[model samples]
Target: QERNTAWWREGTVYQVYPSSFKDSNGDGIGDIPGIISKLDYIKSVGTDIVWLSPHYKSPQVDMGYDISDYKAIHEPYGTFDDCIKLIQECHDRGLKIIFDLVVNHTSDQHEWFKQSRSSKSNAKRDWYIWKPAKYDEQGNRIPPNNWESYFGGSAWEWDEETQEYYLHLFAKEQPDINWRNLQAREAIYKDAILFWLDRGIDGFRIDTVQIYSKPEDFPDAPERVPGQKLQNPSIIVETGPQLHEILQEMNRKAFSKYDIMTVGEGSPPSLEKTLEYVSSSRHEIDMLFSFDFGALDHREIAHTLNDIDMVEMKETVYRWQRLVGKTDGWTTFFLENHDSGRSISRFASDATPEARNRSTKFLAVLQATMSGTLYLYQGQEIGIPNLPDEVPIEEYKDVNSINYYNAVKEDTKNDPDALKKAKKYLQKVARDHARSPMQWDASKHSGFTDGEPWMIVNPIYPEVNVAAQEWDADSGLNFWRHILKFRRQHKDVMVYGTLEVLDKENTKVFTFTKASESGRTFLVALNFTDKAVDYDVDQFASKSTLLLSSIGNVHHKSGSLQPLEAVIFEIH
Candidate 1:
């Protein structure tokens, strides 16, 4: 199991949602200075890298994902000097920093996009994907193809002036770049990638890297609904034919020359496809964020915990674990991020304060003990939950969530119950759930800012704020610190060990063993449910010593585990 090790391979990443982490100015939005003030707090959690979400100049169309200027800082976020100061501050704290690289598209307000759309023969017209309108048999103007945007409606937006359609896989304001154009690629590397590298960034978390290359023919998506005009284009464009070549060129032009790590956002179709991006010899990226676990209960409509299949969940983890164990391909271990709901709310019970605290601790143990580099979202450590039910749909700021809610309300106008169900579902799955302002303390606006927050703060911050957990011995925040420290102490076995999932069919509990080549073995048992479960551990009890527990000082030899208990043991 001996493998070449790097800083990222053995380090932990903490993702900071800039607009929600902290706010320095009274504008009620988080900024670079606010993040700089919390460097020690990030270091206190045993974090090695700080992954900052986009703070580039934008119109906030997709909350900074739609970049208007790759070189300038968002006025609300801070100035160029502030970004440099943050990087210097992080390096002084022995922390590596990486920014969100959103090159798949640029804001409609971007100079390049503006110039591209000015005229069909504009100099930058080929910099973006633009096509002439298709004519129907009856002479009606139609879109180039039946591809749907991620938000809603057709992916192609019609331009009246030019009488052509342009591609935008996301919001209409966020147009997709033409990676097929060599000039666009070079501009991205020089303006976005190398610019940050020169400023001392450790690496990048590439946004939608898989969709950089698109099908040249622009074929219509397969029909999912019988009479639907637009269809999901994810399958058609997820891993394009030329994606690898583009990524390899990027690696050669920028990444390979620097001592940094790169992680792509989208998951490929299968593990085989994944190897094409992350295998050591592929030279594409260091790893990727897989959605297997995140999408376990994902459905087109509303779902509850009953929808999640525990057996399938265990298989998902084991599948990825075995992939890295057998090959040089690496992966990320994460359950929550800016795009998903809180893990405690999605995966476990969050009915009461006790349940929230217990389940959060259990999840921490589960993620920390896993076989890959760990990533913790902004408020995940202190167990942030989804926005309260009282928060109306109008309060949602995410474009996707707002669009889906409106569509559902219109379709179910006559059925009050259906509308209610859809609203409840949106509350659970919306990106706004994770975008709620971070709860730093129990003061006004959760101490995030002196003024009103751009997004509403979770009302339960009084009980779950960081200040409350900072001193509590058994708090979720403290448990995360403890488990991360243990992982670092046992990096050899924890980071590079071969993984074996034991009792894969067990529905209520997850058990696994990590064994190193040097003969060190560790057993991890987790009860994923709220009810105490009986599990036979006599086999390991005789030759093992307890190492860590989520519920504190519990003996596994008792043959029964408390509700949501997680324990790790080192075998003699």
Candidate 2:
């Protein structure tokens, strides 16, 4: 209605992890059609856009990232026409739909991969990186690098039939594509993207975008393990020269054609590099999802990928938002997505029914109030927490969990025994926390599926679910709806506003302001800890209206922030 494609920059999105969001035909697994039926539910929840993860045909090796065919959906989900219907329905309802685009790799089962691997002489053989196995004078099989596949084991996987090794940044099941091949790149752009545009998708959220073209030499990586590293960990990404070349081409060939929202999964990206991808001039992406906030754990990009301290994590958000706020760039704001774990357990400090409720509001508000487009992951409206301890190892579906489980067991024998293993396991377990099924309601299978779900349902679905939260005004689901609606009402101030961090060094609280082009302003304060926090209020005077508060009623003014509280005040 607004003809404002720019709305995404200041908008709020609801992430729909396809497998978990909803189901049709009584199938345990959710499909594109399921989402089409639930368009009303999505609008009721107050979402303007829905960001969908992969639903393409795949071997399910990486749970859909290992795409065999990008042009169509996996038969299990539905058909290409269903995708078109979903897009049209969303537009009819004034809701936009964007899908996750997996370009970094394809399932080994893909015809292209199968044919390319058939022989070294095939014209398309160079479409994927292949190297003769590193060998000694005796010419025995040797790994090319110490870099481990994201799934586990060496990044290099041998194909006995081809007698060559292929590099998979993720799994041996997913072989990386060769962007160096211009024709191959065009194939991905034409078949995968242009067709989607023709069918009317709003845009794409490109998966693992930065690693599309790795360094040509494919040098061995430095040691991840202290003294005796596995082999050479391949530090391939960010080092690739052709990476920028490919990005510019994508910008010109595909992105520049429409007012589409292109988001790059460019976390773990260097600051300068990230700007190049989304600086408006590049024409590559509308915004990028940086791992900066997600990478607050601040381990090595090549090694540790875990959550971080709440205080430090909050600071990370503060700095990145401020840096990219009104500059030439924008970013995809998110705390939880299909890849990351839930926020209720770690970020929500109180854990008590009260604390849990407040923490949900607290974290959700912080992400929403930031400078970029805010993302609300599926079922996050219900305030889903991490999986309860009751879930056993065998029931988990996250590849990261299993991959790290095996990686740590072997890598930690020399470390401080149990403690090191425990720490590593903790990170892996966090990953599994995100993979739990969406808790739609209390009906059978939590009302998500009539049959067994693709993954285990969170055990606490009875207490924490859409049905229960939908009615409770103070419930997390309602809180989010209110937050979005309120932000929408104040779009002039909240959307186009400038941000400035207050109490910059404070570890317990995060505070900022959204100042619009007009004289109006909105003050935001979030308490990250379970314990109550008090801070200066002079800079954020607004007739002090309690526009929204996560923990308690917003009818009256609260001079101080309660534990895990997210409070917003209108500057009169």
Candidate 3:
């Protein structure tokens, strides 16, 4: 609770995926210049920070996450200088840049890993965890342990060159780095972090920040979820104790000079000591982006077909609002990011156009008008929907999605029919769907590239693209602009408001409060379902001002809420 939430207490972030955002060279891949071209658009839409995924040299094994070079940009995305230009451009426009720092592991193709695996007792060989293969009674081969990779294979990969097995933990292409090595730890800072900061890059969105350091002992783990091949064995005692030491040291040496900001992914720090990670005075980092709302990921799948309870979501909103507002640290409010399904389609049913419109407005109203900073993905502003209808599993790109589906099938074998149903449901809510390219235009490849797109474009590209929606008054694009305009004008109402759910009884309705430094209060009410639902607000009835609503036009009369709408009212 001692987090320094002031610096980013009310910021807005725009997340960019390089390959799908735009293209300048007709090379069929989005590059630095392409992103630079869209800077005006980004700021115009009310983004305060731009979060870019990995652009480092990679083998493309798991996209850019398999980085071979930590400092330089891969040829496809553009040169390091080009990245500098983009950073400068963002700074010039008062926009911050946050790097997706994948510090946990590196591509197996990295020079360090290459030399480390070349021989026994090599100087850098300890840079990786290696173990002798387990043998059966007959001395035959077996996996190093029962641990499984997230990519559907044994976590250990045998290397004859070293005559030992190395732990990948996720994918063989991605080798876990030896954070225990002082040289390896400093190399990341010397080669990557400081260089970007020198080029005027703002900060980092620490990818797997909680996963950097691990125990020296790589022992077998007890299974938690049955048939859950690998139980994230490390989470029980995350390298947090070690990670704090490393980050603090790194802060003293490198990050502190730049006054860098850090938002840790999936890190829900204990209330006992959050200041070390996000306090402004601590000089360790700025803020953290924990998966606080991710509890919904494992909710009963049976109820998913109907709708996510709006009232429950509002209650969750109130809790998070209090968590952030009550704490010295601020939270990173998110809808759908690169690791989740597109917000519009994931939370709302794709049954009809009206459903899509209401869903987009409903999700955006909650997010864009909430406390803390907002992280909006590239195409998220335009209310990008998931892949139309359903595509075969072969067409999927996410490795985790498929593996989870198989895990579900293995557990639900009793219902052969249920197994297939589970797979379909996952595909519908798969996070990979959000990583698809941003819909730019109705033109070929959604104006992403002159050549073939690296991934499949959303089929609604023509109808729901930024180009077409820019001029259309009734487009998802306009709604986003209106939302931004409203946020810009009513900044005092959204930054630091006390929240209260107006009605707990209406399962179809959700409501809350977002007020700012000046004691100005904003009440937000939304209808989660397509069907009409009305409510009465007796508390704080005399003092409130109408701000905006997703249900288009609404005139709150005599303390009554408009049906199927999101109404924002300022309370004195």
The models' CA-based lDDT, in order, is 0.87, 0.74, 0.71
Instruction: Report lDDT (Cα) of residue 346, candidate 2.
Output: 51
For candidate 3, lDDT tens digit of each residue in 1-572? Answer: 23334455666788888877888887777888999999999988778888998888988776788889887788988987888888888888888888878877888889988888888767888777678887979989876666666565577898987678887877788888777778777788777677677777777877766666766666666775566455445444364447888888878887767655677776544643555566555566666665646445443222133345555566666555664556665556787777777776666555566666666777778777776667788887777887765666655667666665665666666477876676666666766687677787888878888887667787877777788778877666678778877776776666555556666666776766675656676777776666555466546466666766676654444444444467776666
Q: Rank the candidate models, highest lDDT first.
A: 1, 2, 3
Better by TM-score, candidate 3 or 1: 1
What's the lDDT for residue 73 in model 3?
89
Report the lDDT of model 2 for residue 262: 78
Off by over 4 Å in 3: 1-7, 135-145, 227-229, 237-239, 273-276, 295-315, 401-419, 500-506, 539-542, 555-564
User: Per model, how many backbone clashes are there?
Assistant: 0, 6, 5
Q: Estimate, for each residue in 481-525, the C-alpha lDDT of model 1 and write its tens digit.
A: 988998888876788777888888889998888888788989999
Clashes of 2: 6
Ten residues in a row with the worst lDDT in model 2?
297-306
TM-score of each: 0.96, 0.91, 0.89
lDDT for model 2:
0.74
Better of 2 and 3 by lDDT: 2
Question: What is the Cα-based TM-score of model 2?
Answer: 0.91
lDDT of 3: 0.71
Regions of model 1 farther than 4 Å from truth: 1-5, 137-139, 224-227, 300-306, 413-415, 539-542, 555-557
Error of 3 at 249 (Å): 1.5
